[PDB]
Paper text:
EF-Tu brings aminoacylated transfer RNAs (aa-tRNAs) to the ribosome. The N-terminal domain (G domain) is a guanosine triphosphatase (GTPase) that is followed by two β-barrel domains, important for aa-tRNA binding. G-domain proteins generally function as molecular switches by alternating between inactive GDP-bound and active GTP-bound states. We provide structural and biophysical evidence that phosphorylation of EF-Tu at T382 acts as an efficient switch that turns off protein synthesis by decoupling nucleotide binding from the EF-Tu conformational cycle.
The structure of pEF-TuT382 suggests that the introduction of a negative charge in the loop containing T382 might prevent the compact state of EF-Tu associated with binding to GTP, thus trapping the protein in an open conformation. Thus, the presence of a negative charge in this position is sufficient to mimic the effects of phosphorylation in EF-Tu. E382 that replaces the pT382 is involved in electrostatic interactions with the switch I region via R59, as seen in the case of pEF-TuT382. All these results strongly suggest that EF-TuT382E is a bona fide structural and functional mimic of pEF-TuT382.
Residue numbers in the entry: 9 to 394
The structure:
Amino acid sequence: TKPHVNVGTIGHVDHGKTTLTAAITTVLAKTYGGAARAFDQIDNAPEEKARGITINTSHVEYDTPTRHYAHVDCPGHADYVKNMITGAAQMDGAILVVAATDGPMPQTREHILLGRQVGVPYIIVFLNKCDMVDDEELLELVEMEVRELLSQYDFPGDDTPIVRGSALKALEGDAEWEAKILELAGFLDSYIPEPERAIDKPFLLPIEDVFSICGRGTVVTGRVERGIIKVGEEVEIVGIKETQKSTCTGVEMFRKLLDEGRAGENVGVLLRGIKREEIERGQVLAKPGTIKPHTKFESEVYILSKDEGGRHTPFFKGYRPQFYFRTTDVTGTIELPEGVEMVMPGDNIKMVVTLIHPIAMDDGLRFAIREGGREVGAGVVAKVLG
Ligand SMILES: Nc1nc2c(ncn2[C@@H]2O[C@H](COP(=O)(O)OP(=O)(O)O)[C@@H](O)[C@H]2O)c(=O)[nH]1
Ligand SMILES: [Mg+2]
Ligand SMILES: [Mg+2]
C-alpha cells in the first residue's frame, strides 16, 4: 500500500532531536491524524538488541498523507554510531537537527561523516531553537556553516532543504512555529524519494548452496536479494575466484519450473555451462557488469564491548578476524588509522580491510566481524578500493 520510509533525527546532544521527534508526531497528529507522542515517551528510549549489540533507541511511527515513516531518535552519540553501523533499518533519509544558538558542533560533523560513510543518501536540516535567536544574520551564518559542512562530506549543501523553526514552541502549540514542522514533513515527502524497490535493482543472488540435477546441470540455490533472473539471461558468478560467465538454463521453486526468479524468492537457478566444483562459498549470481569482486575496502566498524558478548581485551595491527558478508566468513587483514595501535571493545573505528578472497561488494554492504564463530563486531563497506 502506502510507501514505508526509514528516517531519524541526527545531530549534537541537546540540539532538540527528541523535542523535534515529539513535535513531528504531535503536529502531524493534530493536522491529518495519527497518534501524538509526548517528549517523555521518546526521551527515555528503551534498550534495543541487534544480535548482542545494545542500542538505546526510540522507534516512533508517523504518517504524512502519502507516506508512512518509521523514525529513529537515540539519546546519545554512541547509540547513533551503533545504529548507523548495525541498526535494524538503514535510513532512507535523516533529519539533521542543529541548534541556532550553538551552530554545528563536534557530533554534527560526526553524524554527517557517519551518514556519508554508511550510505545515508539524503539529509534534511531542521534549524532548531530559533525562538531564542533575535539576530537574523546569526541564523544565516549558522545556515551557511551547515551547508558548507554538508558539502565538505559530499552532501548537496547548496540544495539541502533547511527549515528554520522551534521544536519546543511547536510542541507547546504556537501555530506560527507549528507551521514549520509541517514544512519539515513536506520536505521528508518531496526531497527523500521513495527508496528503490529490490525488484528494480540489478539481479543479485547470494549462493547458499549448489546441487546438480542429473541431465539438467548445476543448480545454484539462494534467496534472490535483488532484481529478476529470467530463463535464457546471461549471468556472472562473482566471488572467490576469477569471475565466470554463464546462462540461466532454468529457475526452479520446489520442483516448479518458473520462467523467472524475483527478489525475495527462494529459488534454484540452473546453469548449464558450469560444474559444482567451480562454485565456492561467498560467491554470488549477478547481472553481468553490475557488481565487482573486491579484496580491499574501507569500512566503518563497531566492536562489541564485553557486556555485549564480545572481547574483553583490545586488538592490535595484526588482528585477522573473519568478515561475514552474506553467506560465509572470509579472513581479512586490518589497517588501522595512522596513529592507532589498538582498538578497545565498545569502540568504533575506520578500518581498511584486505580479504584473503575477493567478494562481490558495493558501498553500503553490511558485514559481521567474527573471531571463531563468535561475533566481535559489525561494519559497513564505506569505499571499495579494489
Ligand atoms: N528554546 C528552545 N529550547 C528547546 C527547543 N527544542 C528543544 N529545547 C530544549 O533543549 C533541551 C534539549 O533538547 P532535546 O530534544 O531533549 O535534545 P536532544 O539531546 O538533541 O534530543 C531541552 O531542555 C529542551 O526543552 C527549541 O526549539 N527552543
Ligand atoms: Mg534526545
Ligand atoms: Mg570506549
